Amino acid sequence: ATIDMNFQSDLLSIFEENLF
Amino acid sequence: SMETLCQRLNVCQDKILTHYENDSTDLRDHIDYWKHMRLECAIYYKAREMGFKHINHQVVPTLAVSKNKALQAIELQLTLETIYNSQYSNEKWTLQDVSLEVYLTAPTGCIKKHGYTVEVQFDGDICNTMHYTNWTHIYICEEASVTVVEGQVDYYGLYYVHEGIRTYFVQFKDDAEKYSKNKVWEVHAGGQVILCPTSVF
C-alpha cells in the first residue's frame, strides 16, 4: 500500500472538487 | 476539459515560479513547492490521456514520464512532511537541499545537506581522478521517523552508520575496476589523505 496509489488518487480527483 | 487543465496549470506554474524566486529557507514552503510539482505532473498525465500533445503550447510528456515525475514529487513531499514533524524542522532548509538532484545522489532516496567533495586518485594518475560527494547530514526517513547520520570516509568508500549498521553508498573499488589497472588509490577528503592500509604486491 504505497506511493503509486497516491498518484492514482490524484488522477481520479483531478476534475473533482478539492478537499485536501 | 482542456480549458480547466490549462487554468489549473497556470496557477500551479505561477506558484512554483514564486517559490523559485523566493528561495526560502523555511521547510514549510518546500512542502508547498513539492505539492504543486505533484499536481503539475497529474495535470500533464491527464492532458496526455485525453489526447493532447501540448498545453498552452508547452510540450505534454508521455504518460510514463509524467507518472515517474509524479511518483518522485509524492515521495519528496511526504519525506519533507515527515521532516517537518521532526526535531529537525526548524533548521535551515533550502530548495537545493530538497531537490531531486540531491535526493537521487548517493545515498539515493535521502534528503541530505552540507555536501562536499571527496577526490580519489587511482594508481597515481592525475587524469584518473574521480570526484564524489560526501554529506555531513544525511536524513534517513523510515515511516514517520527521521534520524540524521553523518557521511564518513575511509579507504574503501563513503558510508554512514544507521542503527549500528555500516552502509557504503560509494565503493571506490567499483571505479578502480572501471578505470585503473590496480586496486591502489589515494583518498582526499579535505586536508588529509587516506592511503592503502594493507600490504602491496
Side-chain angles (χ1 to χ4, degrees), chain B residues 155-166:
Chain B
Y155 182 74
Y156 306 98
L158 304 182
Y159 65 100
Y160 60 79
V161 181
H162 179 51
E163 305 188 326
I165 297 154
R166 172 180 296 222

Side-chain angles (χ1 to χ4, degrees), chain B residues 15 22 29 31 52 94 97 103 109 111 162 165 171 184 189:
Chain B
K15 232 281 176 94
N22 292 335
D29 293 320
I31 297 170
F52 294 90
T94 70
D97 291 334
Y103 193 74
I111 300 293
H162 179 51
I165 297 154
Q171 295 178 223
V184 190

Side-chain angles (χ1 to χ4, degrees), chain B residues 79-105:
Chain B
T79 294
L80 300 193
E81 288 175 351
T82 297
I83 294 175
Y84 188 74
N85 279 323
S86 80
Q87 70 180 124
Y88 310 108
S89 65
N90 185 59
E91 298 180 345
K92 182 196 173 181
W93 287 101
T94 70
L95 268 174
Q96 261 321 290
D97 291 334
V98 302
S99 71
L100 185 70
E101 180 175 13
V102 166
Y103 193 74
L104 296 181
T105 299

Side-chain angles (χ1 to χ4, degrees), chain B residues 48 62 97 119 122 135 163 171:
Chain B
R48 190 73 187 206
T62 52
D97 291 334
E119 167 176 307
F122 294 93
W135 312 90
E163 305 188 326
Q171 295 178 223

Side-chain angles (χ1 to χ4, degrees), chain A residues 2-14:
Chain A
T2 197
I3 305 301
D4 201 335
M5 278 193 306
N6 287 342
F7 177 63
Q8 173 175 254
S9 194
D10 294 351
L11 287 181
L12 284 179
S13 68
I14 195 71

Side-chain angles (χ1 to χ4, degrees), chain B:
Chain B
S1 66
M2 177 206 81
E3 295 206 351
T4 292
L5 289 184
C6 289
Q7 287 167 337
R8 292 204 75 191
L9 187 60
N10 293 340
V11 173
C12 200
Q13 291 182 340
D14 274 3
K15 232 281 176 94
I16 290 163
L17 177 64
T18 298
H19 288 303
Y20 286 147
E21 285 172 352
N22 292 335
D23 203 15
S24 178
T25 57
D26 194 332
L27 186 54
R28 187 90 171 175
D29 293 320
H30 304 323
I31 297 170
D32 190 78
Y33 170 80
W34 282 114
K35 190 172 187 182
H36 284 86
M37 295 284 277
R38 168 185 179 171
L39 175 64
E40 182 184 41
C41 295
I43 294 174
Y44 276 117
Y45 187 101
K46 191 64 180 179
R48 190 73 187 206
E49 262 199 329
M50 294 180 317
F52 294 90
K53 301 259 214 188
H54 84 75
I55 180 162
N56 283 339
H57 299 288
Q58 299 183 52
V59 67
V60 171
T62 52
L63 298 175
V65 165
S66 287
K67 176 172 173 179
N68 180 244
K69 286 178 165 200
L71 297 184
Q72 287 175 154
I74 292 158
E75 180 167 334
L76 265 289
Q77 182 197 335
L78 299 179
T79 294
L80 300 193
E81 288 175 351
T82 297
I83 294 175
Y84 188 74
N85 279 323
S86 80
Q87 70 180 124
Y88 310 108
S89 65
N90 185 59
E91 298 180 345
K92 182 196 173 181
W93 287 101
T94 70
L95 268 174
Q96 261 321 290
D97 291 334
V98 302
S99 71
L100 185 70
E101 180 175 13
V102 166
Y103 193 74
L104 296 181
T105 299
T108 185
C110 292
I111 300 293
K112 304 177 281 283
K113 290 194 286 185
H114 318 299
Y116 62 95
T117 299
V118 168
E119 167 176 307
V120 179
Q121 194 189 264
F122 294 93
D123 211 8
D125 289 322
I126 290 181
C127 61
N128 225 0
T129 302
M130 271 290 286
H131 287 80
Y132 305 93
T133 297
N134 202 185
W135 312 90
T136 67
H137 290 67
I138 297 166
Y139 295 81
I140 295 176
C141 285
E142 288 152 320
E143 127 240 5
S145 64
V146 202
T147 303
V148 72
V149 305
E150 180 191 32
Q152 305 193 52
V153 58
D154 64 14
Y155 182 74
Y156 306 98
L158 304 182
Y159 65 100
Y160 60 79
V161 181
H162 179 51
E163 305 188 326
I165 297 154
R166 172 180 296 222
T167 291
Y168 282 82
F169 56 88
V170 175
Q171 295 178 223
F172 302 141
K173 71 174 185 170
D174 291 338
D175 287 332
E177 284 172 16
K178 188 187 212 154
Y179 299 122
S180 192
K181 306 189 270 193
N182 283 219
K183 284 194 68 194
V184 190
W185 54 80
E186 299 183 343
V187 185
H188 300 263
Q192 209 199 161
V193 68
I194 310 178
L195 302 170
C196 183
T198 80
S199 298
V200 172
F201 296 86

